[PDB]
Each structure stands twice: as C-alpha cells, then as structure tokens.
Design an enzyme around this catalytic site. Sequence first.
Site, mmCIF file in Angstrom:
data_model
loop_
_atom_site.group_PDB
_atom_site.id
_atom_site.type_symbol
_atom_site.label_atom_id
_atom_site.label_comp_id
_atom_site.label_asym_id
_atom_site.label_seq_id
_atom_site.Cartn_x
_atom_site.Cartn_y
_atom_site.Cartn_z
ATOM 1 N N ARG A 24 1.330 23.463 -12.884
ATOM 2 C CA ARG A 24 2.192 23.204 -11.730
ATOM 3 C C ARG A 24 3.507 24.011 -11.782
ATOM 4 O O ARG A 24 4.003 24.446 -10.759
ATOM 5 C CB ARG A 24 2.423 21.696 -11.531
ATOM 6 C CG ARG A 24 3.162 21.031 -12.655
ATOM 7 C CD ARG A 24 3.783 19.742 -12.214
ATOM 8 N NE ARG A 24 5.052 19.603 -12.914
ATOM 9 C CZ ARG A 24 6.241 19.841 -12.374
ATOM 10 N NH1 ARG A 24 6.320 20.205 -11.100
ATOM 11 N NH2 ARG A 24 7.343 19.687 -13.108
ATOM 12 N N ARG A 135 -13.387 -5.507 -25.507
ATOM 13 C CA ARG A 135 -13.565 -4.083 -25.231
ATOM 14 C C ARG A 135 -12.505 -3.642 -24.225
ATOM 15 O O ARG A 135 -12.560 -2.524 -23.709
ATOM 16 C CB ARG A 135 -14.967 -3.843 -24.691
ATOM 17 C CG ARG A 135 -16.064 -4.161 -25.786
ATOM 18 C CD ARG A 135 -17.336 -4.607 -25.084
ATOM 19 N NE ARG A 135 -18.513 -4.586 -25.943
ATOM 20 C CZ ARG A 135 -19.753 -4.692 -25.481
ATOM 21 N NH1 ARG A 135 -19.967 -4.799 -24.160
ATOM 22 N NH2 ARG A 135 -20.786 -4.639 -26.336
ATOM 23 N N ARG A 136 -11.557 -4.530 -23.938
ATOM 24 C CA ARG A 136 -10.578 -4.268 -22.917
ATOM 25 C C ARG A 136 -9.175 -4.158 -23.469
ATOM 26 O O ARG A 136 -8.234 -4.431 -22.760
ATOM 27 C CB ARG A 136 -10.610 -5.361 -21.858
ATOM 28 C CG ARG A 136 -11.974 -5.432 -21.090
ATOM 29 C CD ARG A 136 -12.179 -6.768 -20.281
ATOM 30 N NE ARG A 136 -12.144 -7.905 -21.209
ATOM 31 C CZ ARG A 136 -12.342 -9.181 -20.878
ATOM 32 N NH1 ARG A 136 -12.610 -9.523 -19.631
ATOM 33 N NH2 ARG A 136 -12.283 -10.112 -21.805
ATOM 34 N N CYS A 155 -2.818 7.061 -14.164
ATOM 35 C CA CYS A 155 -2.155 7.127 -15.430
ATOM 36 C C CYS A 155 -2.226 8.534 -15.971
ATOM 37 O O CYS A 155 -3.043 9.347 -15.563
ATOM 38 C CB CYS A 155 -2.817 6.083 -16.353
ATOM 39 S SG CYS A 155 -4.272 6.620 -16.976
ATOM 40 N N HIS A 156 -1.302 8.816 -16.866
ATOM 41 C CA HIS A 156 -1.290 10.035 -17.603
ATOM 42 C C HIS A 156 -2.151 9.860 -18.878
ATOM 43 O O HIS A 156 -2.879 10.755 -19.295
ATOM 44 C CB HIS A 156 0.160 10.403 -18.021
ATOM 45 C CG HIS A 156 0.173 11.469 -19.050
ATOM 46 N ND1 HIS A 156 -0.126 12.787 -18.743
ATOM 47 C CD2 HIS A 156 0.275 11.403 -20.405
ATOM 48 C CE1 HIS A 156 -0.168 13.498 -19.859
ATOM 49 N NE2 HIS A 156 0.089 12.687 -20.884
ATOM 50 N N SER A 176 -4.323 15.503 -19.739
ATOM 51 C CA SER A 176 -4.136 16.910 -20.110
ATOM 52 C C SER A 176 -3.375 16.969 -21.358
ATOM 53 O O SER A 176 -2.543 16.121 -21.602
ATOM 54 C CB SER A 176 -3.344 17.709 -19.061
ATOM 55 O OG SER A 176 -2.092 17.110 -18.966
ATOM 56 N N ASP A 178 -1.151 19.587 -23.971
ATOM 57 C CA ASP A 178 -0.528 20.832 -24.355
ATOM 58 C C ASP A 178 -0.810 20.991 -25.823
ATOM 59 O O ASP A 178 -0.186 20.300 -26.625
ATOM 60 C CB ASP A 178 0.967 20.614 -24.133
ATOM 61 C CG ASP A 178 1.822 21.737 -24.661
ATOM 62 O OD1 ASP A 178 3.051 21.562 -24.640
ATOM 63 O OD2 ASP A 178 1.306 22.744 -25.152
ATOM 64 N N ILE A 217 -3.503 25.814 -23.781
ATOM 65 C CA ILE A 217 -2.529 26.551 -24.544
ATOM 66 C C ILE A 217 -1.660 27.387 -23.587
ATOM 67 O O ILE A 217 -2.167 28.158 -22.773
ATOM 68 C CB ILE A 217 -3.262 27.399 -25.559
ATOM 69 C CG1 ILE A 217 -3.804 26.500 -26.649
ATOM 70 C CG2 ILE A 217 -2.345 28.550 -26.113
ATOM 71 C CD1 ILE A 217 -4.715 27.267 -27.647
HETATM 72 O O1 LIG Z 1 -1.542 -2.156 -8.918
HETATM 73 C C1 LIG Z 1 -1.899 -1.065 -9.640
HETATM 74 C C2 LIG Z 1 -2.959 -1.171 -10.541
HETATM 75 C C3 LIG Z 1 -3.341 -0.073 -11.292
HETATM 76 C C4 LIG Z 1 -2.642 1.104 -11.111
HETATM 77 BR BR1 LIG Z 1 -3.068 2.670 -12.046
HETATM 78 C C5 LIG Z 1 -1.607 1.216 -10.224
HETATM 79 O O2 LIG Z 1 -0.997 2.428 -10.125
HETATM 80 C C6 LIG Z 1 -1.216 0.129 -9.470
HETATM 81 O O3 LIG Z 1 -0.180 0.248 -8.578
#
Ligand SMILES: Oc1ccc(Br)c(O)c1O
Length: 270
Positions: A24, A135-136, A155-156, A176, A178, A217
């Site tokens: 980016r 498992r959660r 999520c990242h 991702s 680096d 890289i």
């Molecule tokens: O209510 C939610 C549940 C999972 C995620 Br990932 C979210 O970004 C969110 O706003």
Amino acid sequence: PHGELQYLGQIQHILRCGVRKDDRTGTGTLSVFGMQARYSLRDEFPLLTTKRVFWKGVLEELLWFIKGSTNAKELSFLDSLGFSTREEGDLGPVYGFQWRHFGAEYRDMESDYSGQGVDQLQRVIDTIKTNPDDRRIIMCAWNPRDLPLKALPPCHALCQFYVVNSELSCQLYQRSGDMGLGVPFNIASYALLTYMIAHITGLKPGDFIHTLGDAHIYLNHIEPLKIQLQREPRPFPKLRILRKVEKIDDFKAEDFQIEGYNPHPTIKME
Ligand SMILES: Oc1ccc(Br)c(O)c1O
C-alpha cells in the site's frame, strides 16, 4: 527444517520463488502466499540468533499491549483523526485496547474501562482453566488503520491456543508478514505471551506455530537478508520467569530474564 532453520529456509524460498508485488506504500516486495513454521518452546525460547533481536522492545511493547494502553507516551502514519488529542499522544481505541476492551465505546486515554467491552485476553486464560480441550481459545488483533470498525473489518492477526498433556501451544496466523523486520519480532512477542499465559495457568509451554498469508520481503531488505542467510544459527536461549505470578496484569519487565543469548550482530533494516 528446524528451529531458526525454518525461518532462513523461508527467506531463501521467497528470494528464489517470490513474485514481485507492491504494497500500500507503493514500495516493492517479493511475495509468497501461505507459509508456516513451528518453534518448540520446551526448555528454549525462539529469540532468533542470526541477528540480534531487540528483546527489551519486545517485552515492553507486550506489557503495554497487555495493559490495553492507548497512550503513546506510556510506551517510551495513515492512522489519524483529531487535533489536540494527537498532541496528547492519544491513539484512539487501538492495539491492546482491543485485547482488553474490544468493542467498548471509547472516551479518553486516561478514562476508565473496567468491565467495558470484551476482555479477549482474560477470556483465553479463563477458557484454558475451565475447559482446556476447547478449540475456540482464540484472540484477535486489528491494524489501527482498519478501524472504522462498524465496517466489520477483518483482523490483522489471530491467536489460537491449545492444551494437551499439561502443555500450552499457540498458533499465530498473520494476514501478512514482513519477513525482515516484523516476523522475528512477532515470533518473540507471541512466544513470550505463551510463556506468560502458561505461567499463570500452571501449564508448561509447548509449541509456537507461525502462519502467514502474504509473506514478504521488502526490496530494500534483500541484500542484508542475503547476508543474514550465510550465518549459522546458534542454540536458542532460555527465558526464565523470576517470581511466581498469578494474574496476567501483574507482570512487570523485571520479572523476566533471558539467558544464554549469543546472537550474531545487529542487522539494520529500512
Ligand atoms: O462485531 C464484530 C465482530 C467481529 C468482528 Br472482526 C468485528 O469487526 C465486529 O465489529
């Protein structure tokens, strides 16, 4: 391959088979999609040895994360909204704030959040105690940039824990990675988190598994990485916790001690 050999084998595969792809920034990478490595946490600690890793930074940033801090000062670019709050060093509802108070309506960085949002990190620790087989046992982190957050942004990183035979294992999945800078750091960071969680739940650490989507890289890191590849890994160090700790919030930087760490010299990367 094993230990740090996995990481060097992965640098080599990207250099050989990586395909050119822009990020980016607009800066150039060599990219491979999909990779995984496993590092035993049993009686050793995967602080990479082929260059010196900034251990103290790893610890301090993790403590700040665990605190759910949103105050930049407490610590030591396209992320931006606000005027006098930026001068303050208020980052908004980001980083550790998500681990401790996910989805909490945000006031100020000195404002008080006990019992607000979801405490993902206490949730993990609680589940490990109430049902180790579960498992959660999963905790997620977001990049500050994606945080519209009504947007249901992905999520990242995602961190799953796993318990068998008294051993706590962790798998980190990163959309991702680096490989030159972030990865060695992230391996230590999440292996440290594992050690901490294992300590307060009476388990022994097991394996750390690192999984990536876009493993990359930066073009400017090739030459220094080419040189890191010629170095032979040394046995990993040990990480020792110094007193008996009971709550994740009670850890302090002085509680930890690295031993037998003999890395090759620092490599500096842009
Ligand atoms: O209510 C939610 C549940 C999972 C995620 Br990932 C979210 O970004 C969110 O706003």
